[model samples]
Target chain A: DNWLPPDWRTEIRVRTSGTKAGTVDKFYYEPITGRKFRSKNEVLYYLEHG
Target chain B: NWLPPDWRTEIRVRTSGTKAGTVDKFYYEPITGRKFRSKNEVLYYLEHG
Candidate 1:
């Protein structure tokens, strides 16, 4: 494994403020990859790997 | 360093059905005399001034 994550410096935190109701709600979104979720437990997993 | 580190910048993350009442969605305040909203904007002032 390389020293840096592929998305380490790529992702920037943006507001997902639920563009619509019954949606993803507020969470950090990757504009490039479309990976989004409301749980830190899951997000942290991605941060560690993907 | 004119700009140390902006670690305070953060978003209000939701958990277990989100939160209510007061929440700090985003906030930035520095002792510098110049007023700014973005990190680049803050650096611009320190560099130009």
Candidate 2:
């Protein structure tokens, strides 16, 4: 099983064109909470305080 | 430039072996600590939001 909560989904974003094209960004999206986390620090903060 | 000309940008990467256990990256606008997923998102926020 995954370590993250079941409702928490991961988003993988990539730039298909334009500056730094092909670059990728990750997002942890929680639709239930209407919040998104793009880095580990953000995730930790939310988990500990949100 | 089309993008924000003065805002600070930061790019971060997380490898697959890390705690998240997935390889991906993050791009942020440091002034607001806001992360953007695409160019359009950045433009929409800076231009209209």
Candidate 1: true interface contacts recovered: 0.03
**Index of the highest-TM-score prediction:** 2
* Per-model RMSD to reference: 13.4, 8.5
Off by over 4 Å in 1: A1-25, B1-49
lDDT of 2 at B35: 72
Give every candidate's TM-score on chain A: 0.36, 0.77
Q: How close is candidate 1 to the true structure, as a TM-score?
A: 0.24
**Over the full model, what C-alpha lDDT does candidate 2 score relative to the true structure?**
0.60
Per lDDT, the best of the predicted structures is 2
- Compared with the true structure, all predictions reach lDDT values of 0.43, 0.60
- Residues B1-49, model 1: lDDT tens digits: 3454532343443322224332333334445323345667655655775
What TM-score does each of the candidates earn? 0.24, 0.46
Model 1 CAPRI quality? incorrect
lDDT of 2 by residue, B1-49 (tens): 4655544343334332224545333446645667776667786777777
* Collision pairs in model 1: none
Instruction: Supply the global lDDT for candidate 1.
Output: 0.43
Best candidate per DockQ, number?
A: 2
